[PDB]
Amino acid sequence: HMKFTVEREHLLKPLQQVSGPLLPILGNLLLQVADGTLSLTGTDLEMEMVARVALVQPHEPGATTVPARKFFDICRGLPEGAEIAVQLEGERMLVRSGRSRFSLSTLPAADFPNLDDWQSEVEFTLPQATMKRLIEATQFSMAHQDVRYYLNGMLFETEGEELRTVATDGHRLAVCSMPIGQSLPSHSVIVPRKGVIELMRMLDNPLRVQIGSNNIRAHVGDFIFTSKLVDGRFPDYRRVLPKNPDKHLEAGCDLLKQAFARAAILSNEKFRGVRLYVSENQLKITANNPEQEEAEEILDVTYSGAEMEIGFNVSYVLDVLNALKCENVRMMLTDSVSSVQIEDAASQSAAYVVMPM
Amino acid sequence: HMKFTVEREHLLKPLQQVSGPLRPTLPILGNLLLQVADGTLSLTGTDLEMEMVARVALVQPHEPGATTVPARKFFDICRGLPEGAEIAVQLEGERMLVRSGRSRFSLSTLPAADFPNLDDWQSEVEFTLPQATMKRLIEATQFSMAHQDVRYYLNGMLFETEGEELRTVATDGHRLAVCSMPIGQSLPSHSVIVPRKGVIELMRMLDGGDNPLRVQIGSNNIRAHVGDFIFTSKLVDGRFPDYRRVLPKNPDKHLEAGCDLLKQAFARAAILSNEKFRGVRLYVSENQLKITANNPEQEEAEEILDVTYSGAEMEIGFNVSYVLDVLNALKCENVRMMLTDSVSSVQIEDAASQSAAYVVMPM
Amino acid sequence: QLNLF
Amino acid sequence: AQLNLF
């Protein structure tokens, strides 16, 4: 029955990737030798990650499941360049290399959880860098463990020739759109928070994406990731974007980040409120706490609108600025009770909307 | 009232060092004591058990006085400021105003008179030694300290001066580490126990450069000076175990093997040992070591290694973590196992050096 | 901290 | 399982 012999460095990166998503069967990896190929699959029932390793040595077809973390740690603990020999034998898999011998327990491959067949309704390819940019630009705005399950995920929207990602936790929002070269149908789904984290780590140049009505799949090199989609209806970003900001402020991304990072130190540990005074070519950031401590930062910026005060959760601001790895930032204000739009001054690819305190 | 103006890079390293003992409980303990006197700023942090004092020469106009300020806020402020920033401090009200460029901060204070004070004590033993020696002595044994044993005395490290050697010992009852190093001076016989936190802060004051370490040890305290930094700790009360007496009485069986090969053998076997108990089994035979491990899952691993051994055959079990710990600490090429029988402890050493011995008890 | 909508 | 010294 199942047998293969492979170099350790052939297995390390795949075993690692498919272990990402991790009942006892769920702690196991499905192993499948077929057609001169080993397949490794890991699953949490919501999503699954499949890796393929070409087998250039004698092998025999078959399948079993083995504990993921013990199998990885064994192959990782083995010396650089080792030949790992695997074979199934009743209720145990045997892994052998030099005078190192291991006997792992198995669970039947028939028992291993399957994600049901589904149909792709939307298909496109795009470079990995673009999938990264889209996820990096908005991931941080996802709600963590909100009862609004539809917020514990990321919207993926295809519109015209653009793929767009949206993320919000109700208090702040991030939207990023990137051009992809093929006219696409209108389609809008929510990928769960975990799937977004997993799909992000498989980027590590073309990714092929397939999207059904309750499923998303990403093919990347020798990896196939698939996830359930989150049920429900995501908020419309067109509708959170400030209606028409009249007041535009420009400043250095780093100088602004650092002013805020310093003010943040003496803001409320709970609420993290800082105050912004905008005036002709100047931003005053202030913070105070229950200790009666206070910080005050004055910056030169480019602004000529009217004067206004506005408060913010400084962490929301720092998050945005940390994600905008750029030179100058654009703050788009309206009034002291309305949200602000923040953008890279040189690029409209990504917008950020943060609600005031 | 206190005033000083200083470059940021003058304050970074000191603020960092004295913030060591700093979860939050008793507000004054989250504060640093600041003292301008005699052209010098002193910064003191404390947890009541230990304290660390840093001195900064003041080359700019200053005025004497003292106050306390939150340590972490004051550090984060100075760390947050740009390179080369001038940091101007003053007092008005019960606050401390810190100013650099157009960045302005107002910190709350607590009176300096309220700041906790480790009582005066007398040095009875004094020596210097290189920082690299203090490091080696701590790194070689730190890991054998007991975690939170009700024998308070095992939750610490023995520091023993004898003849021309400083020695450290550490044990949790099951395993033991002893390291001795020469320091070029004739010393009196003395033994003290430095607490867990004291060993951490002290290992952490070792910047790893040239300044030698000046130690002073008293009846219930210890102090180390390096540069313009001064660490002081209470000692743990009680009587530490005698290492002379744990060391196997006379091992007859000596085994040599590669440190890395033996480590990786055990690390691999460890994967399929009992998660709770972590038992592995050793079978020594002429020039060979078999390591095996099994678990409730009926899984097993087996590693065979070539070694240098010609004694009698024997089986012996070990907590594999204790073994791995020792081997991780012995950053060397070949190891020496010194066995007696299956019910007796083993002594492990670097094969090239007798500076450090390790005794681990069998399962 | 206020919610959108 | 694992004995103390002494």
Numbering used by the authors:
A (entry chain A): 0 to 21, 27 to 208, 212 to 364
B (entry chain B): 0 to 21, 24 to 364
C (entry chain C): 357 to 361
D (entry chain D): 356 to 361
From the paper:
Processivity factors, or sliding clamps, such as the prokaryotic β-clamp and eukaryotic and archaeal proliferating cell nuclear antigen (PCNA), show a high degree of structural conservation despite limited sequence identity. These ring–shaped proteins topologically encircle DNA providing a sliding platform for the majority of DNA polymerases and many DNA-interacting proteins. Most typically these partners bind to the processivity factor via a conserved motif (β-clamp: QL[S/D]LF and PCNA: Qxx[I/L/M]xxF[F/Y]) at their extreme N- or C-terminus, although internal motifs are not unknown. Pol V is a heterotrimer consisting of the catalytic UmuC subunit and a homodimer of UmuD’ and was originally identified as being central to damage-induced mutagenesis.
The structure of the E. coli β-clamp was solved in complex with a fluorophore-labelled synthetic UmuC β-binding peptide to 2.5 Å resolution. The asymmetric unit contains a single β-clamp dimer with a peptide bound to each monomer. The 12-mer peptide consisted of Dylight649-C-QGVAQLNLFDD363, with a cysteine included to permit linkage of the fluorophore to the peptide. Residues 356AQLNLF361 were modelled for chain D and 357QLNLF361 for chain C, comprising the core β-binding motif of the UmuC peptide, with the remaining residues presumably disordered. The OE1 group forms a hydrogen bond with a conserved solvent molecule, with the NE2 group forming two hydrogen bonds with the main chain carbonyls of Met-362 and Pro-363 on the clamp. The density for peptide Asn-359 is well-defined, due to a hydrogen bond formed between its OD1 group and the NH2 group of Arg-152 on the clamp surface. Peptide Leu-360 is located within the hydrophobic pocket on the clamp surface defined by residues Val-247, Leu-177, Val-360, Pro-242, Met-362, with the main chain nitrogen forming a hydrogen bond with the carbonyl group of Gly-174. Remarkably, and in contrast to the other peptide-clamp complexes, peptide Phe-361 does not penetrate the hydrophobic pocket of the clamp and is solvent exposed. The principle interaction appears to be hydrophobic in nature, with the hydrophobic portion of the clamp Arg-246 side chain. We suggest that greater reliance is placed upon the UmuC Asn-359 to clamp Arg-152 interaction, since no intimate interaction exists between UmuC Phe-361 and the clamp, with Phe-361 involvement limited instead to interaction with the hydrophobic portion of the side chain of clamp Arg-246.
